[PDB]
Amino acid sequence: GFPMKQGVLLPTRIKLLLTKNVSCYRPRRDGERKRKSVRGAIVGPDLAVLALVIVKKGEQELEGLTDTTVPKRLGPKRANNIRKFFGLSKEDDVRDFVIRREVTKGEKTYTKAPKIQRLVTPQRLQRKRHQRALKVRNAQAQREAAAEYAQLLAKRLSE
Amino acid sequence: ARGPKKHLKRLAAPHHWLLDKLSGCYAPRPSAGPHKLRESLPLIVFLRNRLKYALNGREVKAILMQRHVKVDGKVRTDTTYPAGFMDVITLDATNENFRLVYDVKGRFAVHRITDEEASYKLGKVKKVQLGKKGVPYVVTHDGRTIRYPDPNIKVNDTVKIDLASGKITDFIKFDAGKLVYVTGGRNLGRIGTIVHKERHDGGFDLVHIKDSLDNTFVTRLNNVFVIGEQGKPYISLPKGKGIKLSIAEERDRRRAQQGL
Amino acid sequence: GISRDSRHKRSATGAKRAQFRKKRKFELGRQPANTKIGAKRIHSVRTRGGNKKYRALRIETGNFSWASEGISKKTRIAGVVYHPSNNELVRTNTLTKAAIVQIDATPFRQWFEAHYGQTLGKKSKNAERKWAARAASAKIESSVESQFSAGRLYACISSRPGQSGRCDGYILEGEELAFYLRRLTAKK
Amino acid sequence: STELTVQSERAFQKQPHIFNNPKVKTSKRTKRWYKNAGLGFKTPKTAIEGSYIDKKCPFTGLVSIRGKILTGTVVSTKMHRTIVIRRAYLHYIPKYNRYEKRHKNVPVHVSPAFRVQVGDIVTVGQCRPISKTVRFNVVKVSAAAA
Amino acid sequence: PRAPRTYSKTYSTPKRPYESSRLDAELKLAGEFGLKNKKEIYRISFQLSKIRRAARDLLTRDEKDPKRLFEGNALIRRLVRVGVLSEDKKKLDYVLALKVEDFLERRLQTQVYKLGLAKSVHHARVLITQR
RNA sequence: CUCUUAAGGUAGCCAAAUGCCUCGUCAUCUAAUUAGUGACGCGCAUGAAUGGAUUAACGAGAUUCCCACUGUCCCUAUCUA
RNA sequence: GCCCGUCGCUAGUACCGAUUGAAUGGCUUAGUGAGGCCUCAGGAUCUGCUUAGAGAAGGGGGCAACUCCAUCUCAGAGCGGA
RNA sequence: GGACUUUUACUUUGAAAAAAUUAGAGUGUUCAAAGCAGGCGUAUUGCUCGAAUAUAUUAGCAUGGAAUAAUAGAAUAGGACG
RNA sequence: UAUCUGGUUGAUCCUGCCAGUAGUCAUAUGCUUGUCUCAAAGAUUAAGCCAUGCAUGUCUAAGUAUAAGCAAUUUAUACAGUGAAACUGCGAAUGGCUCAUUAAAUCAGUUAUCGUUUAUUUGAUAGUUCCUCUACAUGGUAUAACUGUGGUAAUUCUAGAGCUAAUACAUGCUUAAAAUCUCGACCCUUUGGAAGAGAUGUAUUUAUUAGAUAAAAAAUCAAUGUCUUCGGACUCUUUGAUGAUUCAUAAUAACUUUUCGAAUCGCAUGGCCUUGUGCUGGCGAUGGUUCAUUCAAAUUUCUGCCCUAUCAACUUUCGAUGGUAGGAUAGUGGCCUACCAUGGUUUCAACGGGUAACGGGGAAUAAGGGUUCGAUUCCGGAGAGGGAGCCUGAGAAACGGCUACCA
């Protein structure tokens, strides 16, 4: 049952201390490394299965593999990720371009689509707008309060 | 002990809250806030123990989740919020403005105030210091830090804050003859003019206090809260004007008042 | 690991102390940085409550200060030349605070010979306008001038590399330079 | 026991960040930062017109004096730049309604500013751990017996 | 980790277990007040001892002493409101010489006897413990 | 109390280089001990300068065991003159 | 009359005692030394930057001439990262 | 007018102090152990007292006192005051 | 709540013990046991071993939904209700248990931080980011869940292939006026003077400087600052806190695998005139750097622990006491190292031993003074079979976390 491990070398099983973001191990709580077994990267006769990936195709179709073709499941969902997917321009507006997929209830059929994100919206630009002004207003209001006091300070000597 | 404690055993709580012994194992334990946890008064004790508006603990939240209570003009929603000295607490949907201010015994008393006065607060400056970029700042006991203050305001002086805009508006110095609350100690609850600040370089200065009855008593400087001019307090005072009565004197007053 | 607890120490009376509790991270110590001289290489170390110290393992180029001229320039750092704690720090050229080091002189030459006009011990009006005024304060210590002949400068490390990650320091002057100078002739 | 020729240590000895420009000819050969220890302790002339360093001195040094301020008689002047105080006291055993003489030994650092011999009553002030056992600094010295 | 629901015990037993003197006196109090057992005499005999001590102590203070006054009058005041201390033995000196029956007299049981109702302190009992 | 023959083995010590029976009994060491040691003692036939008992140091003296070491052995092989 | 000691029986107690007696725990000599951690290396695998050539763009503004920024694709020459 | 014990012990009075427990005031848990509640009235939208006080004999801090008991100082004057 | 009595003699009076008597938040046990209230309880011996179940998870209107979920209907052709799963965030360092270790340790009252760290709550705080032709109507790749091809007796194991998100990961724009400083094209020689070129947020690191003061008047050398009545003149001149600081705070010259300065979300749908999906704009949320606060933590001053001398000298093994410098730390410190000295504790009991020893609040016993107890309802400490090690995080030397040895 034990899986090979990219780049151990060796044709046997060895126990490793495994950490986050490493194959053959999914940490159950942030910080948990776990000393678990792993099989060598070198192909020996002890194998149950061997995962191969086709790089170059040969002279004959393989009935179940080369011939048939299976579809991705989800399309782009971010803004520009749709734009890179359809070779569009910044000015093109996604929205009327996103992959939809039909839903068949039993008598009523409807559809559904993502929710493009990073999407530029009326609302978003209103937010940058508010922040900006917030910054300038307070800056000026600060510079009045500073100036006011620096006057109150002068009078704490003149008088 | 590996980190901050989160519970409080109902027994290790401040006595002045006056919670009973049996009920459950626990007392609320003040959240982190503007007041020291032993010098504070959770909104939940207020609403349910002192006010009797709540029964359950559930009902306290149910109340607070209705944004029904402002502390110093800001709606407060945390059951264990640590309100404290000079705090205001405004119960809007019933026309009530209070101000946590001490008994004579030592317990945070129900002192209602005008729909005015809930406009402001007295705040004892704790430190006054040069902040970065040369800008000065004071710090009141209630965790307020108002920048750009009057250069005459030194430490132990009190200060009139607005509320709805922060901002200091007039202030009182600390010298001989000023009207003073006693914020903690054995004399917790008393009021009265100063007389003498016994200073001791190194540690703990002593402030001899006389009241509107000529009883003298001393506490520490960290315990004195200046609240006005002799016979002129900048906040309305609870019944009995923080006087202290000998239990003899105390006995007489009850039974005589009693009857008719 | 290491622990900076005073528990394990004998008492002043001399008494052995029984083990009270186990080690706690909030009293630990870490292994030293014996910062060397080479291509920049600093490892950061996650201290208590967030925070970063910076284990500098290899250092060339640290920011140095000529105190009397009022400036600071970033030299090379040649090697270490002395060290009051342990001479092994010299032998193996390890960089620490209070190190004593030879550093390049050319950035300091380049400043002197354009702030003053003079060369070191051998146009334009507004250029010469200043020069003549900045003069009469252009004679420095002879113990500091002659050094420039070798294109290297005796300097002392006032940073803490294995912490700061920076090997800053100042060029030895005055009576300070006299003293270390003295130690150098009697061994080096 | 004895006080050095100043620069008698493998590292140069100086107060920190107390610069004297060689570019500037002066009177005094070396700048000398000292201070007011506090509490009505008068920094002596020895602290000021002396050439000693001692980073752990309550004047001319980087150490504050706060907390207790104790007095004991001097009992051991053998350590370099630190001495041993004896503090005699009386413990009250309730049961016999009587007292017993106990004593304590307080290691305390003594600036070169004071020439302290054994027998001297000495006033010292608590001052942050200097070293393993030392938490006090000789801050005043009343006379011997002659 | 709750809070200790406190308690104390109400009686005390005699040091010498077989004083036929005391044993005689006790029984008289048992049939002349219709008592159940000795503990009913013990209880009060304890009760009484704590009073006389409290008194005893205050009597060692100065008169006009803040403490003596508040809690000397207090003692007397309680002992009056009950029927133990008579309308003018209202001093601390008299609370000392206060005897036992002085208490036992004021029992519901003895009182139910003391105004018709029962004709017998034993009748009085079985009447009270029966609503 | 008595008999031979003058006395009748005290202090000690022991299956001891003195004990037949005897490879004594008990304990200990060991898988197992006709061995060793510690004890026991009606001791064929221990014993007081015919010296008894004790004893540190010493011994190419007799004896038992432990650690080390090892071709003594298992189990023999190879080399040099 | 009282009464001392050897000697004799029974039972209990502690003491001495060959067993280089035994067991448990603390601290330890010397030799050996896991592990995670820090460091000199290692580099399965991935990868940011620069650069000459080629194809397809669009103009920083022209009667022919002139010239940026962004993206994406195949021999390479570099110095870097995980 | 503030600061003021040569250097102490002693003693007074306070301060900073935890609750529960203890002592102890109030209160009819039906009594009591307890509890810290409760009480008054038009009880058809109310009013209202409480939840005190004492105790800590070490040491530390602040303070009034200076009897008792220790302690320092002018004798080659190397004394004191200005 | 200040008491005694029985037992040595023929009798006597004493010494003196034994015996009685009374209580016990004092456990066991025997017998007995109807009602009300109150309700301790596997501490003692074994911190001995543990079947099995449970004891820590978490979603707002407000970070991520294309479920080949569910309801639906929305006005919904980007999304829009509800919502498994999963990513993100936070929590799991609290509680609860137990008393083994521990005798100057812990702990108690009392100090210190001018010796440090501090998620969070509360209050403050950011016009400066590029560059001598830049996306800011918004940059870039990757992954989970999911689909599908799989392995193994077995587990909260997971492989290789294919998809797609963000407040996950990685990037990166922006904003007024002035002022001050260096470099200085050039002109015109005197009192000489300058155009415009750059630099100037914060945080980091080093150096230097200011951070004044008890009360007054002159002379100079050096580099230059105002003015006027062009001779020479200058006044009303500026600075906080502490008992005490190289304090707060500021300035100069630079330093940096350059910290941060919103590419986030929910409700609102208003208002200007050139009418473009232009310009502006409200109530909150979630973040963010610094400082204060708060809940804490870490060290820490002074005094205080039972039996013991059939423990009298102990400590410097291989740090014991101290000096200097560094390294390490959140930080002081022989905490560690290097060098240097020979110091430190003790009959006022050191050192060592014992303890059927966690410290205290407290409990029992009542003339008093004392005697004895305190595993255990509250505070503090410690530990999770024994030890050591470490990850993650603000916080752990964590054990319902991991790694190793031992059992």
Ligand SMILES: [Mg+2]
């Ligand atoms: Mg978004």
Ligand SMILES: [Mg+2]
């Ligand atoms: Mg809370």
Ligand SMILES: [Mg+2]
């Ligand atoms: Mg422990």
Ligand SMILES: [Mg+2]
């Ligand atoms: Mg006393």
Ligand SMILES: [Mg+2]
């Ligand atoms: Mg014959």
Ligand SMILES: [Mg+2]
């Ligand atoms: Mg004989």
Ligand SMILES: [Mg+2]
């Ligand atoms: Mg004889």
Ligand SMILES: [Mg+2]
């Ligand atoms: Mg024999």
Ligand SMILES: [Mg+2]
């Ligand atoms: Mg033989």
Ligand SMILES: [Mg+2]
């Ligand atoms: Mg034998």
Ligand SMILES: [Mg+2]
């Ligand atoms: Mg043999």
Ligand SMILES: [Mg+2]
């Ligand atoms: Mg003979």
Ligand SMILES: [Mg+2]
């Ligand atoms: Mg003979």
Ligand SMILES: [Mg+2]
């Ligand atoms: Mg021999």
Ligand SMILES: [Mg+2]
């Ligand atoms: Mg051989």
Ligand SMILES: [Mg+2]
């Ligand atoms: Mg052979």
